[PDB]
Design a binder for this molecule. Structure first.
Ligand SMILES: CCCCCCCCCCCCO[C@@H]1O[C@H](CO)[C@@H](O[C@H]2O[C@H](CO)[C@H](O)[C@H](O)[C@H]2O)[C@@H](O)[C@H]1O
Lengths: 1042, 161, 107, 107, 268
């Protein structure tokens, strides 16, 4: 401690070494958008090509709800048995548990359910995957000069992209937007009716005829003696073109004109799927969706992926140009520069105050030298802690500048002044300053560490967010304090100039501002003034009660948040066509949207990405999606050119002048969050009921909670509503007569109207699928039920109109689950001005009052936020209790910490007051701001009160006079610091451009908080201190202690 | 068949249990098919019962099998999913469609078991459906609706008939 | 359960169930002959119970025009049972079992 | 010596009689396609082979934890899993963490 | 696989099977001109053997009443073999194999002695549908990083040390086709790794004891005065290592770090 005062170079070594500890800790330090914030979930999906809702729920889903029993860290099971054949189970897990543990546990509990799958699934896999929706990227692929169409792009995408670009240094998961090539065989039921042939004979044709086969070997082992040759048998070989498949034989007629597949059906090298359509500005495109890598940098995934795409880009076909409709990278690149930028400004402004007060080049430089050693060395504190330098944490740094310089600054002042009051040599007066103010610095260390720690031990996403500042500003804190035991004190004695007793500077320079007198003159006004109030206490007690009270009322009338909203340079508008509509009407909507953006907002939009076929709730021709990217932030000025107004006028444009519900919107800051005032009610069927009853419950309840405009809000379903289905009940009697085979009827119905994955072939050197679906026009109109004939056992065909009754019933096309049992997703919300949980109480009261097998339970957003709920008061009571007891400790009593605790309201009342005026919100950034304010307030009170009690004690002076002296001499520093702060934090406060929701949010609460805190505390604290101490001890008295 | 693998103390439990199931699938395809179709459960477990909750019927007018069904209908889906449970032995049995073959009345009508099997297999299933206005349709098309097919059964009626 | 054991006698050469049964018996009587070292030397488990071979003369069935496969699967679904399909009770899946009736498989 | 070599999981299977480019571009590089996102990978070695044995050796960074490796990677293969053969899938398939160094061979 | 390395020759471009093979025999033949650096330069992989194509013509048999499945399977189980079920040997499960005998499966004509039973009851020779030729094929195709590669295996010539042969390898891999590159894996991979460290460990560790010295035991000049001693330590470790017959490996590196170590102690 004192010891390093007389080892200045040893100190230096610590300084240059730690600064380097910094630079080295910076160059290879990770950067992300935010820290990994969201609870990890793993999802299981399977593909049952052509099934209906009840089917993928009842063949794949339910036998699963029974065999993956027993994975640990159980939490909840949300599922969709899509009526497209996809079954999707998202297990969303408890925060921060290790994912991969879950992932393997599950993949090895499905292989328990595996033979208990249907065989078309069983052959087409089931996938278990750790999952988010956080696409780092969606990279488009297009051809400019209409050279290829969606399936060509898609095919190349699957054959020339996904193995070598995703070798680039920085990559996690890959997802292809489009369809891989598959050998597409389109059966004509006429040309199949002709030769009495049905799908089954076709199936059996391509299956038996198309493969590799068990060869054998000449000289096979074990051969027999004398042998002098060993060689391999080749055989029947899998096919290769569209050519080799038309030449395939199905049956030879007695006349000799053989019938090949080329005849009965049509042949094209086609797509494995024609569900979703991908349009880049209307032009054909197919796309890719990329997730970041396991601790990887976003910007280097960007440098290497974009370099890689540029490495195959001439080695791409003609017209084939890669596109970037969706990146979350420049937002982050620019986020970083804007935050450094503000910090740079903060540095310079702090230094400005620092000069225009200390005015001595070498003395004004010492605390400026103070800063790099401190940050750079803090980066070293981060590089070793396993976290990342993102916007938020480095924000903790820019925020930390105040609790950094504060210490060092105080010391340079205390020394300069003592050197004006005792005349001693640099080093000695310095020594006294360091030995008397040890308590100032170790005290601040004790309490700031005391206030930023309690937040790190908070839960949830917001809690981890807190973890980041805790560590940055505490490391920053402790190191600034500790530099204050090694660095700052030696820098204090040594690089600082010696002063004789009473130098004062008063108007002792003319061109450089006489200024100093004014300060000094003014502090006389200040000082006489504190005395004046000290004489008359009661008044100040009362007015305090005012500030307290105001602080309270005002706290209430300040509305919460979870995080601020962000113009990300990228937003999206989604489309929704009424039940059962087709792909066509949706596609009308997508290009019409594309018109709106490229026209009535032509200047703002750069590229639209139109997606037809799966949108929000699920997959389904009637559903659409649009990615709207903008021109770089430099060219979007006003209120009207930023995401806000754009979304407003977009959805404005579409709501009242269409037949379809189509909405435009802006994405959250955090790439997955609590939907704030609200929930996602899971309505669970527990009793032996069925889908009709839950839905009727949806009617009942959507009617039961929407009837309270005073508590509940947005009673809406998320999903697709109840669609028209076409039951074709086959009467088996009739076919058990006619000599037709059921397998023949079924598999023909299937392979005709759904289709069948039959075999595999080898296109261009890569294995792909072989599909035989009927053609368009022979299975698109109800009437086409007819054109299909079954070849009996005897030998003549039968119409479906010979055995098939045909009707329209009802079903929902997206079958939801919550833990293996029948469930329903009611998204919902509390009134904009009601807490969400109150809405939980009234909604639970309605959904309680529903039929037995219609229950209530919680999922997603309202789950974790229900268990980890009633705790925020407890931890901030702790941040406070740590403040009261820790400073009661560094000193040595009780009454003496109370007087410093009286300051927090002077601090709070300022964060509310300034923020309320702007329009900000008691969210996180205002919370971290709030804590920091507490810190500031107690700091300053530490300054003054410390000096007064010290004198009272160890030099025995009188209270009032000691408070006045302290108050007098400590005015100057308090002010130096505080000005450094307000001015350092300022730029954040008024800056627009990336995350300014963030900058502004930190800044405003922090600034106004600091102002009222000081400009009121420097008048209250001495009266806090005086009256506080005046109710403890008896004799003394007003102490003279010699 | 019950194969209990006891691991070195303090080892990673779950890593072990999962390792086991992805070594179940090296030997799994070449297994019997009556088994493969009747599942095998691999579950990390004590060497004894931790707890037993009983259920009985007040008026007694339920049979072991009835109560047992109820258990299976409203609770025992997550008891093996609590982040600490291996196998639960259910005291009872969940319901199954029980067809009790009469061997005289089967010799009567020229049919044997084999015929009963292939019968019920074929007559009882879901079926590969399709979609009206299937994708990819042609212009003007204004319909997409769900093709339902034959559905697996539901009552005692459907199984007698 | 205090001072004791769970002794495993493992067959290693491959002498099948019988030789093991007898070696274990030899042993179990051999330990009952030392009350000055052991207590309750008991085997834990079940012995060898009466089982009833229905040996099929494949030939007589190979002329006769019956197919063995069916004959097996019949004996089976008769006295053991068969898992055939799945159905939907009250909205929840269960199994499909066809076993013989009571009185037609007990003696 | 210490755990010196970078960690690899090897997959081997039998497709009796297949050719070099099938088992190279059907069985081998059919997995290495969803192997995007591996923790601490160093290099990748692979075999097609013309006797029906197919080998995909995925090799990662020293101490990147094996049991852990087979975790993320057997589950990154079990994602690349659909483009391999099913005749491969039916006859004995091994995913086993591997060196290539016989620690010992006893005769 | 041997003394120091396992040189991996990697395909990066879009050239070809044939052409690459020609580029590498080009290198393995181009290096035989160096007895003062290399010894036992050998190639890794299986090259390309004679294959025996048997095309079965489906039509001709699709009449004759023979079923394809039956012909496939028989061809197989004849010259490949089949796993059917399992049996119980001596108290242990084992497999069951049904393959032909030896002498009917070593020469092509034995195809003849093989007949497939049609639907009617008469057999058919393979010479009724099977054309047969001699073409070529590859067995086992090597890759490094998923792409076509060849390990030019080697050891250094008996003339001492292992790494000079590796540096000479780096000189061989220059005069070959546009798209043909070099990398090291295994023994020499690490020799890439523990080699090009020379700038970094010495960029850093040298600066660290400098500050360590200006530290607890103070001053400016003291670390300079002591630090001029580092060459004095090495030039003997270098002098000796050359004189004997050694090479700048790891053991010489620890040899060095240590030596500069005691030396810096002394001047300290
Ligand atoms: C913007 C609205 C709210 C902001 C104002 C908050 C308070 C800060 C202003 C302080 C300056 C005015 O303060 C007023 O003048 C002086 C110095 O304080 C004192 O006045 C004093 O004069 C004499 C001096 O002996 C009396 O004996 C007694 O000590 C007291 O009356 C105070 O009692 C106060 O009434």
């Amino acid at each position: 401690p004192n010891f390093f005062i007389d080892r200045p170079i040893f100190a230096w070594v610590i300084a240059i070494i730690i600064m380097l500890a910094g630079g080295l800790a910076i160059l290879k330090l990770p950067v992300a958008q935010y820290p990994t914030i969201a609870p990890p979930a793993v999802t299981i999906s399977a593909s049952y090509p052509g099934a209906d809702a009840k089917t993928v729920q009842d063949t794949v889903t339910q036998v699963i709800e029974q065999n993956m029993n027993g994975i640990d860290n159980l939490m909840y099971m949300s599922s969709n048995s899509d009526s497209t054949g996809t079954v999707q189970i998202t297990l969303t897990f408890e925060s921060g548990t290790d994912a991969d543990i879950a992932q393997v546990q599950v993949q090895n509990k499905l292989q328990l359910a595996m033979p208990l799958l249907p065989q078309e699934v069983q052959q087409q896999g089931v996938s278990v995957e750790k999952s988010s929706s956080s696409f780092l990227m969606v990279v488009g692929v297009i051809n400019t000069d209409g050279t290829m169409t969606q399936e060509d792009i898609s095919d190349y995408v699957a054959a020339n992209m996904k193995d070598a670009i995703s070798r680039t240094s920085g990559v996690g998961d890959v997802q292809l937007f489009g369809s891989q090539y598959a050998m597409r065989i389109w059966m004509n039921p006429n040309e199949l009716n002709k030769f009495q042939l049905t799908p089954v004979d076709v199936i059996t044709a391509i299956k038996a005829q198309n493969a590799q086969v068990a060869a054998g070997q000449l000289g096979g082992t074990p051969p027999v003696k004398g042998q002098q040759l060993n060689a391999s048998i080749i055989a029947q070989t899998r096919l290769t073109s569209t050519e080799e498949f038309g030449k395939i034989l199905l049956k030879v007629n007695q006349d000799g004109s053989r019938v090949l597949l080329r005849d009965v059906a049509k042949i094209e090298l086609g797509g494995e799927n024609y569900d979703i359509i991908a349009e880049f500005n209307g032009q054909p495109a197919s796309g890719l969706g990329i997730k970041l890598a396991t601790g990887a940098n976003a910007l280097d995934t960007a440098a290497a992926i974009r370099a890689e795409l540029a490495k195959m880009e001439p080695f791409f076909p003609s017209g084939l140009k890669i596109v970037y409709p969706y990146d979350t990278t420049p937002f982050v690149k620019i986020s970083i520069h804007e935050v450094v930028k503000t910090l740079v400004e903060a540095i310079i402004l702090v230094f400005l105050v620092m000069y225009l007060f200390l005015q001595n080049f070498r003395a004004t430089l010492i605390p400026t030298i103070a800063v790099p050693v401190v940050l750079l060395g803090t980066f070293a504190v981060l590089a070793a802690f396993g976290f990342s330098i993102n916007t938020l944490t480095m924000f903790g740094m820019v925020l930390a500048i105040g609790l950094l310089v504060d210490d060092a600054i105080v010391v340079v002042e205390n020394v300069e002044r003592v050197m004006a009051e005792e005349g001693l040599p640099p080093k000695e007066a310095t020594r006294k300053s360091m030995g008397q103010i040890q308590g100032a610095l170790v005290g601040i260390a004790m309490v700031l560490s005391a206030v930023f720690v309690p937040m790190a031990f908070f839960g949830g996403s917001t809690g981890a967010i807190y973890r980041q500042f805790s560590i940055t500003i505490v490391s920053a804190m402790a190191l600034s304090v500790l530099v204050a035991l090694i660095l700052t004190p030696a820098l204090c004695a040594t690089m600082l100039k010696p002063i004789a007793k009473g130098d004062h500077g008063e108007g002792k320079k003319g061109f450089f501002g006489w200024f100093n007198r004014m300060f000094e003159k003014s502090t006389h006004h200040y000082t006489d003034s504190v005395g004046g109030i000290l004489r008359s206490t009661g008044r100040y007690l009362v007015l305090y009660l005012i500030i307290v009270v105001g602080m309270a009322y005002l706290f209430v009338r300040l509305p919460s948040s979870f995080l601020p909203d962000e113009d990300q340079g990228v937003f999206m508008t989604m489309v929704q066509l009424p039940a059962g509509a087709t792909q066509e009407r949706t596609q009308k909507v997508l290009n019409e949207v594309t018109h709106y953006y490229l026209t009535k907002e032509k200047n703002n939009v750069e590229s639209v990405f139109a997606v037809n076929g799966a949108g929000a709730a699920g997959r389904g021709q009637n559903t659409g999606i649009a990615f709207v990217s903008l021109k770089d932030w430099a060219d979007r000025p006003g209120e009207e050119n930023k995401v806000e107004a754009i979304t407003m006028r977009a959805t404005r444009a579409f709501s009242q002048i269409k037949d379809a519900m189509v909405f435009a919107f802006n994405l959250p800051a955090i790439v997955e969050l609590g939907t704030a005032t609200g929930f996602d009610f899971e309505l669970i069927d527990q009793a032996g009921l069925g889908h009709e009853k839950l839905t009727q419950a949806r009617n009942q309840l959507l009617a039961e909670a929407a009837k309270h405009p005073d508590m509940l809000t947005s009673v809406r379903p998320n999903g697709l509503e109840d669609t028209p289905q076409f039951k074709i009940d086959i009467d088996q009697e009739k076919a058990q007569a006619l000599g037709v085979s059921i397998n023949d009827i079924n598999t023909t119905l299937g392979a005709a109207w759904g289709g069948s994955y039959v075999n595999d072939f080898i296109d261009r050197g890569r294995v792909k699928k072989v599909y035989v679906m009927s053609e368009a026009k022979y299975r698109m109109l109800p009437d086409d039920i007819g054109d299909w004939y079954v070849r009996a056992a005897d030998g003549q065909m039968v119409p479906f109109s010979a055995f098939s009754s045909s009707r329209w019933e009802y079903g929902s096309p997206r079958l939801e689950r919550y833990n293996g049992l029948p469930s329903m997703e009611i998204l919902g919300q509390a009134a904009p001005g009601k807490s969400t949980g109150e809405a939980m109480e009234l909604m639970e009261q309605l959904a309680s009052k529903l039929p037995t097998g219609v229950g209530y339970d919680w999922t997603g957003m309202s789950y974790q936020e229900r268990l980890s709920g009633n705790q925020a008061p407890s931890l901030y009571a702790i941040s406070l209790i740590v403040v009261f007891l820790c400073l009661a400790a560094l000193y040595e009593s009780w009454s003496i910490p109370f007087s410093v605790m009286l300051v927090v309201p002077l601090g709070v009342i300022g964060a509310l007051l300034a923020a309320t005026f702007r329009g900000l919100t008691n969210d996180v950034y205002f919370q971290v701001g709030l804590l920091t304010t507490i810190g500031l307030s107690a700091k300053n009170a530490i300054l003054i009160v410390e000096f007064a009690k010290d004198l009272m004690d160890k030099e025995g002076k009188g209270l009032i006079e000691a408070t006045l002296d302290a108050v007098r001499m400590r005015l100057r520093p308090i002010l130096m610091t505080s000005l450094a702060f307000i001015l350092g934090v300022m730029p954040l406060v008024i800056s627009t451009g990336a995350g300014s929701g963030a900058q502004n949010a930190v800044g405003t609460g922090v600034m106004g908080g600091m102002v009222t805190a000081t400009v009121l505390a420097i008048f209250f604290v001495p009266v806090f201190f005086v009256v506080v101490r005046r109710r403890f001890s008896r004799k003394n008295e007003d102490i003279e202690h010699s």
